[model samples]
Target chain A: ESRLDRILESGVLRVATTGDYKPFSYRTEEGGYAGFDVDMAQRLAESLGAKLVVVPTSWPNLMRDFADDRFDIAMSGISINLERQRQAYFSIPYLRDGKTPITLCSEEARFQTLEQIDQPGVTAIVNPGGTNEKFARANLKKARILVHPDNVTIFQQIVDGKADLMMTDAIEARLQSRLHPELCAVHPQPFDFAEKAYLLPRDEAFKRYVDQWLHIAEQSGLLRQRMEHWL
Target chain B: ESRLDRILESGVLRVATTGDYKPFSYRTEEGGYAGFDVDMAQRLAESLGAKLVVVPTSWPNLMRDFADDRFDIAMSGISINLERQRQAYFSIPYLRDGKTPITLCSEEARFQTLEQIDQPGVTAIVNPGGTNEKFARANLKKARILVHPDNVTIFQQIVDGKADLMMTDAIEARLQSRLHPELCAVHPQPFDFAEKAYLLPRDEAFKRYVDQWLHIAEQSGLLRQRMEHWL
Candidate 1:
């Protein structure tokens, strides 16, 4: 039987994901995974007439886990870029958001553009890993760059005035701006236009099935409806 | 076993998607699905260690098909908004694009802002079932609103002078401008911000798994890679 046929027979879809990145995926106060991705996974499970197995992984360990066959798919708010496609297949983009600045609403004047932020005396706080780090490394020659490990608390450094700003995806900026209240999105566009999708190993038949399913769901307006509520 | 666990054993991930939107999801000449969503779905299936099943769907019949349990998850360049969330769940946003105006390069000066387009003298073309339509309905009070069912050729209305402008997502605007050099994005920024995500039904456990997997995939950078390639 085809791989798709086999999955239909067995009735389970093992998925790999993480509990970081608020507004998309994150750990609930009760210690369970919750957020936008979770909602969609549940729906995926229902469609397959199967159960969903949540395999928690760290941001750094995803490729290792994927290579090890720890799960079937990763569905968080992931950006689609060329650097990682060398590693796996990605879905048709569900969204096209880009990277922008997240800074205190009060410092609006100092960090408006890349030119302004890429200067001396500006301490940019970034969480290690992903585009935030890469962007800082590639840019910001004169500015001081600090790599912080805790994504949950990295923005706090800015809240407390320890860091001047952080370059983050627009989605995170939306949630953080509301959570922090004191911070705001600077120019919300034209920094890094990031397309996000699921990452999978090369498997032609399986890929075809996924693509068709997405086409239906998207046309039906399920993807849009849920995103509005969560975002 | 829980649905999550059963999915692990079954080894099939069913995805629902469409092939209409470009740069995000579309069909190639080979009569096969390719583009951003297809890439991601392939990755999702591989991650699950299952075969991918593509369930073809139409723009109008999504709700009926999903309600009938046609697939596991729905993907594509779907926008996140509250109108549909009333029906289903959404994954964490993968990208954030928004509604922007696409007009003839010659008309750039005449139709720049919503206020200008809202005038009775303006004619805006739109394909149905997206925020683009909603935006036109909600905002374009005095303008001539034309609904073109053929998304592939909808922009031609402007080229033929049947329509003066169209409210489209920034991503589509980008490709459209390139494909139809006569067209250009009037103002890419300062428009409706649309968050795209996966749409699912009301299943909590499955949702958790999907969210976690997305988080991990995002951190791993695979999502970013594929997204860059397709977009």
Candidate 2:
């Protein structure tokens, strides 16, 4: 009843869309929200008898801006972090990616590629506030990660080839694989972890409701179907 | 690379199955694992060029047994919880359920009607874990929930009228409705959430595998297709 109770109490499930991280949460061609996370969020709200209210924000300030009393839930694929857990509650992780070894580090690459990155001419972009950045900082020690204002610009740089090899969320990489098939993704051989979820400010009731909503979303296959609906 | 790597490295993937959840994980007519969980887990193993080794266990003891090294990954409708998170890990939820209201305080279902539960000496049953228990405890404060060991026993209670009603996961309830036709899954009133997912031990290394496999599983629409195959 948590789901229904929330919907009856709140007319709409106010959700934030960072407009980045395609196939999970992103802006549609029609400029509306679409993707696994968005659709799942919408269905959750509907099941609870609430309408889905799409709230858009730049990648730069999605979490921080929404940190205020701005929305009921952030439908964006925010990562689970100890610090954030103190500020907001995380639903069960809906997505994950991790740090992995690079081909350049492989003996097969003859370490030449590793040496190339050692000189610091190579740049790799990692989306802000995620496992990719954490992994890049730790493993891509020789490579530099350009931290844009938000996650969207990280992809833009990869498209422009400004970044030599970018570490990205796999879902984002999957979408990019479709958009720029020529651009390859580095699936970390010893990948680090990237777990994503919607966020609710630290309210026990709200957290309980969101968690349940997430479970329902998974059961209905709506989450997976949304991925197909997009990329 | 965990499941994929493990499979490619050993040429085998040990699929964890409950072997009894039905449509998800259950036994075949051949007395072997052959439910949706078994099917999907094997497919992924084969995709990675590995033999699928089916591991089976009961729900209550599965996670603990798996943690003790009885299995590699669990493919059951395990609900993710803070307690479980401390001992084990979970992939993104695979099955979802919604919460609905129930009659309470001996009332005649003022919200819905025709509940007819709450009669003198009446009792209702809900299976262990997931949203149904949560819902029963929270809203139906007046009713007592008879916790049964398994599905067959639970069904017997409702059919024998030993219990006034039964609150079950919608999927199971739907099956019961098909067989009995008198029972109904309260719709337009599912809890704001349902429970879903596979299970894992909280190994730091395995965390990446859980995320990647789940991401791939969800993106590939394996989650949705599996639902249709079962439901």
Candidate 3:
């Protein structure tokens, strides 16, 4: 039997999520996890007539935890790529995201394109140990990139004018841009594409069931409803 | 004088956009041209201290029309590719998009992978005279394919069960899926990316000015705000 079938029979649907990444999954000030992915796990548990439990996971240990079957499904706006797909089966993407630029409103025109940003004096602030770090390392060869340990404060560096820009996902960019009137997320369209999906095991049956469930939630307005309400 | 300079001096910024392509640029039911591109043109004109004028154009004649200096810029969700880039300078992409699958929520699992859909008896419906047709022709060797004339009703083909699936842009898929509760957009990641950009003449001064201004609009929340409000 599949992991999902097993979860249903056992009456416990375990989910893994991280404390960071707003709008997806994050720690609530009161002590438990809350966000879109948390809502998703809740919905899945309800659908299967099971109890929902959240297992803490992080970017560094996500794959290992999943490999160990620490949770039946791991999600927190988890990006789907070929590298990760090799280790686990990814459900069809629930959200679309990409690497786009966020910069000071005043400097937006100055660093309008990649060529302009990848210059000797420009500095890009990035967070360590994720796509932001990898992208900053791969690109920004000509620019000085500073890795900030916390994802939340990277944008403030640009606001303080200590850094020129930061490359980030559209969801964060949009909300951040709105929150910070002095900063903006520019040229978002030509940016690279990344799909956010739920990471599962190699079992095709489990993958099929999860993908189908996601499809139903999306079609029934449940996905969008939650996304709109939470995000 | 440069295009922006001349436009400012003349007080009229003539913009070219196709009469097709909803949401980006198209003719409105109110007997006028309006869309995201039109809003963009208006914003650019306002920023440059000029008046906005629509110079109506179409797809086949876009390059020809632009070459003849029919308008200052073309802002109709124009695809940025080498062929067109050779003829004109494309501004930074305003939106990133991709070809994804749209199918009945029930059939999502069956068509989760391209390999599953490319086999015999699997029917994929595509709109003619666009990338969808080109993509299907290049792929899907064994699947039965049908070309639909109207994109607005093509999604209905699947709802009616006349077609099993359709490969279209993620924007269309997301909006259509929400519009038709029976359908859902699937496999958005691992999907190919296409950029939608504004086309301008190959004048360096003009290109630089327009590009920088577009960058400012995007960064300052004007672009995203308008897109969110309109689209």
Candidate 4:
């Protein structure tokens, strides 16, 4: 039987999220999660007639936790890539995004392109063990790379001049730029292309249900409505 | 073991198609298949290091053929709907389309909306046992519904005045209108929303690989380039 059958029988849907990413997923002051994907997870549970159980996960341990069956699905702002596809499935993409630099507003012009950002003296900070870190390492041969443990605090490091910039999803860069007016998203366009989708286990039935549900949510404008509220 | 393992070991990827839908899947004069999806199936087989084997099936027998393992995947211009999701999986959607009425250019003004088209004397032609028929049945309560067995010749029936119009995918309507300048697509928009995707059996590993490959094809602009040539 598929995991979908089990979820329906138990009336519980376990959704994993790294509660460090703002707008998409984050831990609130009340020790509860509240973000765009958190809201979507609740809606997904509702559709299945199940209760939502938020399972905490870390960027470094997402694949391990998923392999160990720690959650039925991961609903945070996870990017779709081939390396991750080796071990898991992803729902149809909900958003098209790509990497862009977020740096001090006054210094945006100096780091507009990868060539400028990947210089010997430039410092780029990233959250550990995720696409952000992987991209920084893969594309920045000359820049100093720092692995910050907390995504929520990583932007503050850039503001404090501890790092020159951060290369992340354009959506995150735009939201963070708005929140911190001192920073600017250095782009008329993103540097690369990627998609954000919910990560799933190798269960065809469950993936089908998720994809259909997401399709409806997208077509009906519910997904876009929720995203506008958070982002 | 997953179906992907078997496909790799067997060195054959069987792709099912109706061989009737134009611009998507069709049988040429030489009795060989040629269309957008036919080319895509060849590319999919190449990625798996396997040879492509075209398996012929009909709309009425698609599910049965799939259940009997006649093919690894169905690459026709199939619409994504919940009824099909109950028994099979779909790759990520590649096209966003909806039902639109295609009628004689002279009568375009008379059938712009459902209310106008659903008159008692209006006969809407559709292919048997598919989304087109299902839609015609569901929405055209007063209109005369004609089940035409051949989707290819169904448009000609409209030209010969045997039917008033054919409500089908907007993409098809647009293409057929271009081919037969006597016809016109009656809309600035469509009557409903739908998506087009590849159909697969309930195999998660195979579905994952297909989705990743499709994602790469779409991102690389290969999918768009091929579609522009055909559509």
Best by lDDT: 4
TM-score of chain B of 4: 0.94
TM-score ranking of the models: 4, 3, 1, 2
Q: What is the DockQ of candidate 3?
A: 0.03
Q: State the local distance difference test value for candidate 3.
A: 0.83
Best by TM-score: 4
Model 1 over residues A1-231: C-alpha lDDT tens digits? 344665677898776778787666888888988878778778876787878878888777887887787877787887865445534566666777877889999997777788999988899988887678888888889999989987668889998989989998888876788889999877722566677777665555665676677667788998898888787
Recovery fraction of native interface contacts for candidate 3:
0.00
Candidate 2's C-alpha lDDT?
0.61
- DockQ of every predicted complex: 0.02, 0.07, 0.03, 0.27
Q: Which ranges of candidate 3 are over 4 A from the true structure?
A: B1-231
TM-score of 3: 0.55
Per-prediction TM-score to the true structure, in the order listed? 0.51, 0.47, 0.55, 0.59
Model 4 over residues A1-231: C-alpha lDDT tens digits? 799879888999999999978878998999999898999999999878799999999888999998999999999999999999999999999989999999999998899889999999999999887888999999999999999987668899999999999999999899899989999988754678899999999887988899898987899577888877887
Say which docking band candidate 4 falls in.
acceptable
Superior candidate under TM-score, 1 versus 3:
3
Clashing pairs in 3: A189-B95, A189-B96
Residue-level lDDT tens digits of model 4 in B154-224? 89999999999999889889989998999998785446778899998888899999999999999999999
Could you tell which candidate, 3 or 4, scores higher by TM-score?
4
